[PDB]
């Protein structure tokens, strides 16, 4: 019983027009309804190579976008869940869009001239925007597939790494390699506000309906949540020592230190997930700085290279001595991580060739394996979950982009059975 706390209610009783401003948690619990054993798995083989991102507009017809290191924004349809995704239009870049000055503030050429990296569709469906190493954020009209506005990043290091829209509102959040986070209105095509703070390049950003975004640096081992208006931020550091793991296990495998945090998806307001290069999928919580649940290597250890290859020496018993057994081994990276919002379910993608989908526990203090989607192989970059149907019984369509390389560079060995194209999979109930 307090004086001002009554008065705080009275002033806030009159408060109006807060929908996205009000928080929303995990309320949707279809994770036990899903059947992964019998879920159909369809793959397509597109002509372009080194695919980089997929984004899909969903109405309040369904759609699909792909972008590949052939510098080709490509226009697709997925609206029938029983058939493979279909070509509608495209736009290949090239070298005819190389800027004239090559040094000025202006980079106002309409097309991408080198190495797109990321795409995102505007949640009204009216626009779609592409970004890359060409340090140009070009938004595209959907219908005629034409450059509607080109945005120079105005910095020499400002290569775009990820694009993140707000749900149902065209505030566009964009990550850049020069430790910048540019924010954008798309209806007015104007630069909002610039955010600062990572020690490393900013590989991934994701958002929800609220005016908050979560970004990760690569090598810094920090994940930062943001307030856009107040321009304040949080800091989530990992730092699990192997010696705290080993001496924990000495009361009775391998443990890995974390090279990077690469990808991040935001599942609800109070929790999210991050991918690492040492196979860690850390469930994070806003109340804590440490991860609320660390799950070590998801896709497993990276395949060990063959004993004959590494030595180059004819003595066979000498070849195994150079490998140093367990010391040489490495894990799969986590190169894809996306949850359908406010749900108990998220999908991880790598080049183990199994989109390992996880179930969040209902107490939201750990998560747990649902299953695998083994039809894909090779490096997987992005994940977009598209739902349809009624309220309770929902048909889904996971779409993942498969390249023979990573988004950012090669950094890869012994890729096999991997074709460039979209992996489509419908899970029912």
Partner 1 sequence: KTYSTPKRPYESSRLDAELKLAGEFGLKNKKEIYRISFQLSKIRRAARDLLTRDEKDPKRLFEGNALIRRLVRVGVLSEDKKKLDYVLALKVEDFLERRLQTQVYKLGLAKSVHHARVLITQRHIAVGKQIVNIPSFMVRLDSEKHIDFAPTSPFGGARPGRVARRNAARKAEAS
Partner 2 sequence: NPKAFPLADAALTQQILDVVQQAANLRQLKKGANEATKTLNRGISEFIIMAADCEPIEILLHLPLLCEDKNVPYVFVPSRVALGRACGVSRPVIAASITTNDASAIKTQIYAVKDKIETLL
Partner 3 sequence: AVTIRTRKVISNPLLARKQFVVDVLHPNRANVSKDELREKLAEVYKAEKDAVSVFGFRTQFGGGKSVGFGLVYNSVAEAKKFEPTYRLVR
What residue ranges bind partner 1 (CB under 8 A)?
A: 104-105, 154-156, 178-179, 194, 196-197, 199
CA distance 192 to 184: 5
Smaller CB separation from partner 3, 13 or 324: 13
Among 88, 98, 194, 257, binds partner 2 (CB under 8 A): 257
User: What residues are paired with 403 via a beta bridge?
Assistant: 379
Least Cβ distance, residue 358 to partner 2 (angstroms):
25
Least Cβ distance, residue 94 to partner 2 (angstroms):
20
Least Cβ distance, residue 114 to partner 2 (angstroms):
13
Least Cβ distance, residue 305 to partner 2 (angstroms):
7
Place of tokens 């050429």: 109
Q: How many CB atoms lie within 10 A of CB 54?
A: 25
Candidates 106, 1, 123; CA nearest to 65 is: 123
Binding residues for partner 2, rule CB under 8 A, total 32
Question: Would you say 95 and 81 are in contact if contact means Cβ atoms under 8 Å apart?
Answer: no
CA distance 327 to 217: 27
Smaller CB separation from partner 2, 34 or 329: 329
Give the sign of the dihedral formed by CA 190, CA 194, CA 199, CA 203.
negative
Smaller CB separation from partner 2, 278 or 343: 278
- State which of positions 204-243 bind partner 2 (CB under 8 A): 218-219, 241-243
Contact footprint for partner 3 (CB under 8 A):
11, 14-18, 185, 188, 190-193, 229
Identify what 191 binds: partner 2, partner 3, partner 1, none; CB under 5 to 8 Å per kind.
Answer: partner 3
Identify what 196 binds: partner 1, partner 2, partner 3, none; CB under 5 to 8 Å per kind.
Answer: partner 1
CA distance 329 to 307: 13
- State which of positions 307-346 bind partner 2 (CB under 8 A): 309-313, 321-322, 324, 327-330
Smaller CB separation from partner 1, 174 or 360: 174
Least Cβ distance, residue 225 to partner 2 (angstroms):
23
DSSP 139-191: EEETTTTEEEEEEE--SSS--EEEEEEETTEEEEEEEETTSEEEEEETTTTEE
108-119 CB burial, b ≥16 within 10 A, e <16: ebebbbbbbbbb
Least Cβ distance, residue 416 to partner 2 (angstroms):
16
In sequence order, what are the residues at sequence separation of 6 or more whose Cβ sits closer than 8 angstroms to the Cβ of residue 406? 335, 379, 381, 412
- Beta strands of 61-132 (E only): which ranges? 64-68, 72-77, 86-92, 116-121, 127-132
Least Cβ distance, residue 222 to partner 1 (angstroms):
10
Q: How many CB atoms lie within 10 A of CB 236?
A: 23
Give the sign of the dihedral formed by CA 170, CA 173, CA 174, CA 180.
positive
156 binds partner 2 (CB under 8 A): no
Least Cβ distance, residue 105 to partner 1 (angstroms):
5
- State which of positions 395-424 bind partner 2 (CB under 8 A): 408-413
Smaller CB separation from partner 1, 118 or 153: 153
Q: Which residues bind partner 2 (CB under 8 A)?
A: 200, 218-219, 241-243, 255-260, 277, 305, 309-313, 321-322, 324, 327-330, 408-413
């Amino acid at each position: 019983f307090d004086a001002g706390d009554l008065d705080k209610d009275i002033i806030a009783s009159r408060l109006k027009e807060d929908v996205a401003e009000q928080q929303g948690r995990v309320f949707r619990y279809f994770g036990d309804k899903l059947l992964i054993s019998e879920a159909k798995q369809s793959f397509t083989r597109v002509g372009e190579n080194n695919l980089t991102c997929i984004s899909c507009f969903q109405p309040v017809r369904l759609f699909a976008y792909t972008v590949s290191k052939d510098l080709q924004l490509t226009k697709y349809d997925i609206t029938d869940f029983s058939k493979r995704p279909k070509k509608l239009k495209y736009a290949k870049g090239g070298a005819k869009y190389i800027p004239t000055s090559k040094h000025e503030y202006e980079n106002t050429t309409e097309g991408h001239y080198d190495e797109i990296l990321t795409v995102a569709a505007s949640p009204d469906g009216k626009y779609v925007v592409t970004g890359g190493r060409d340090r140009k954020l070009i938004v595209w009209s959907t219908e005629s597939l034409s450059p509607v506005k080109v945005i120079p990043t105005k910095d020499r290091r400002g290569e775009v790494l990820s694009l993140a829209f707000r749900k149902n509102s065209d505030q566009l959040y964009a990550s850049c390699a020069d430790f910048k986070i540019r924010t954008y209105s798309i209806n007015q095509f104007s630069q909002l506000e610039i955010l600062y703070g990572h020690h490393d390049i900013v590989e991934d950003i994701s958002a929800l309906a609220m005016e908050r975004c979560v970004t990760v640096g690569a090598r810094d081992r920090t994940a930062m949540l943001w307030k856009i208006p107040d321009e304040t931020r949080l800091t989530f550091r990992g730092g699990d020592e192997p010696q705290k793991l080993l001496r924990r296990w000495m009361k009775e495998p391998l443990f890995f230190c974390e090279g990077s945090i690469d990808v991040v998806s935001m599942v609800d307001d109070f929790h999210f997930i991050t991918g690492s290069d040492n196979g860690n999928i850390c469930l994070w919580s806003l109340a804590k700085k440490k991860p609320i649940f660390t799950e070590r290597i998801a896709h497993g250890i990276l395949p060990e290279p063959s004993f004959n290859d590494i030595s180059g020496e004819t003595d066979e018993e000498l070849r195994k001595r150079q490998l140093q057994g367990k010391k040489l081994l490495q894990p799969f990276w986590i190169t894809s991580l996306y949850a359908i919002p406010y749900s108990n379910v998220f999908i991880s993608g790598s080049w183990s060739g199994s989109l390992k989908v996880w179930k969040i526990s209902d107490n939201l203090r750990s998560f747990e394996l649902l299953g695998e989607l083994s039809g894909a192989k090779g490096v997987v970059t992005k994940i977009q979950v598209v739902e349809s149907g009624k309220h309770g019984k929902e048909k889904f369509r996971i779409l993942a982009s498969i390249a023979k390389e990573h988004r950012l560079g090669r950094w890869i060995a012994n890729v096999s059975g991997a074709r460039n194209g979209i992996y489509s999979a419908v899970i029912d109930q």
